[PDB]
């Protein structure tokens, strides 16, 4: 393989300093990444978008925390779809009268699985055969809890933060026909059905709903919409990344395990490849990103450029020892092929020359780390990304 320069223009000349990265390099590479990768997010925020709080529990979690459940409609008139917002806020903070940083992600299997709460309402939605204990594609009282290994939320209430997160087939069941029943088809006007070339798919859906979860967390007197750090596990990193690349608003960015499409370069064959998550998740990604399959050395940017997008923005990329499909050693490359962008914002990336060894993250405000065992998203990922949202989630200060 071998890569494009996030640091060349499209037209050869050379980005020399922040103006130009902000101003006309970034746009350049956001356009290649919609028309050819993940299809084009037809409008941001949409007019009337309604929030309607429907429970409000202010001891949840034993004291711990107020829970609220949020109705994010996007239209104004009651038939428009909607997604449900569940947030968890640490009744410390609210005690002092301060606004909490949030981490805001998308959920698997639904809210109700993030963790064991029964007040927590029951998706309605399809839920995929995968999901632990369901019955008929439809929750049930089993499946409470049935994710919270991946959702620490008493240890993440304690640090400080607040916990948001919305089911991610709320947005794009995550099924090879979900398109049809997803925010995509009310919103691009499903008067024709094929949806074209350049039209987004799950990932830019979910990575959409991110960003309007955020014009909830805005609008809540508990929360510093300010200080928001995305994250999301496998492919919700890879929306994660994608919803931190488009929406500036969000401070930090957090892509665990994310892989092909996600953190991982394409141009590097290793582990799942792009003729590979296309066929097997054709409505992931653009029908444009199928010209690439097999075909990767013709791709015009690299997963590197997706990357450098955050900047200046603090980014953590982190791998699992054991998931090669996912190709740790390019989730790693990515970051350092990034890091010179990082760099012309006066930010470090990673020491040392290619992966570091296990449980030892590298890097300054740009970070990686790979941990023992397969994929997930374990206690040690989480530890290392509260002291980095410690670090680095801008203050609510200067």
């Known amino acids: 393989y071998t890569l494009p320069d996030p640091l060349v223009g499209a ?18 590479l956001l356009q290649l990444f919609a028309r050819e990768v993940y299809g084009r997010t037809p409008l941001g925020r949409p007019e009337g978008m309604v929030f309607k709080v429907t429970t409000m529990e202010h001891a949840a979690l034993g004291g711990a925390a107020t829970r609220k459940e949020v109705t994010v409609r996007f239209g104004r008139d009651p038939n428009a779809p909607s997604m449900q917002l569940l947030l968890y806020v640490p009744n410390a903070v609210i005690a002092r009268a301060e606004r909490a940083p949030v981490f805001l992600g998308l959920n698997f299997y639904g809210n109700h699985t993030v963790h064991t709460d029964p007040a927590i309402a029951l998706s309605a939605r399809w839920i995929p055969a995968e999901a632990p204990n369901g019955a008929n594609h439809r929750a049930t009282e089993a499946a409470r809890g049935s994710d919270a290994q991946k ?4 240890q993440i209430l304690a640090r400080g933060y607040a916990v948001a997160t919305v089911y991610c087939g709320d947005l794009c069941p995550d099924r090879p026909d979900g398109l049809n029943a997803s925010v995509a088809s009310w919103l691009d006007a499903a008067a024709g059905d094929q949806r074209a070339p350049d039209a987004w798919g799950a990932i830019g859906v979910w990575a959409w709903g991110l960003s309007r979860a955020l014009d909830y967390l805005e ?5 510093d919409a300010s200080r928001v750090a995305v994250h999301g596990h496998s492919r919700l990193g890879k929306a994660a990344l994608w919803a931190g690349a488009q929406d500036d608003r ?11 499409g996600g953190a991982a ?16 998740f054709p409505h992931w990604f653009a029908r444009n990103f199928r010209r690439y399959d097999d075909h990767e050395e013709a791709l015009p940017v690299d997963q590197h450029e997706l990357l450098a997008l ?5 980014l953590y990329v982190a791998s699992a020892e054991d998931d090669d499909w996912a190709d740790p050693r390019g989730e790693f490359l990515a970051v350092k092929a990034a890091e010179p ?6 930010q470090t990336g990673p020491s040392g020359e290619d992966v570091p060894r296990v449980n030892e993250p590298s890097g300054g405000a740009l970070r990686y780390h790979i941990r023992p ?7 040690q990922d989480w530890a290392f990304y509260l002291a980095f949202a410690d670090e680095w989630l801008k203050s609510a200060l200067p």
């Not at 370069?265 to 097997?280: C, D, F, M, Y």
């Open 11 to 28: 037209d050869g000349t050379r980005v020399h300093d922040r103006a130009t990265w902000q101003h006309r390099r970034r746009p350049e």
């Open 151 to 154: 959702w620490p939320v008493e």
């Open 219 to 223: 609008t809540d007197p508990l929360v």
């Open 250 to 260: 969000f401070a930090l960015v957090i892509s665990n395990e994310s892989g092909c």
């Open 265 to 280: 370069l394409s141009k590097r064959i290793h582990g799942e490849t792009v003729a590979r998550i296309n066929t097997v």
């Open 310 to 314: 955050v900047a200046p923005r603090p």
């Open 341 to 346: 962008v990082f760099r012309l914002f006066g």
């Open 373 to 379: 065992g397969p994929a997930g998203m374990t206690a």
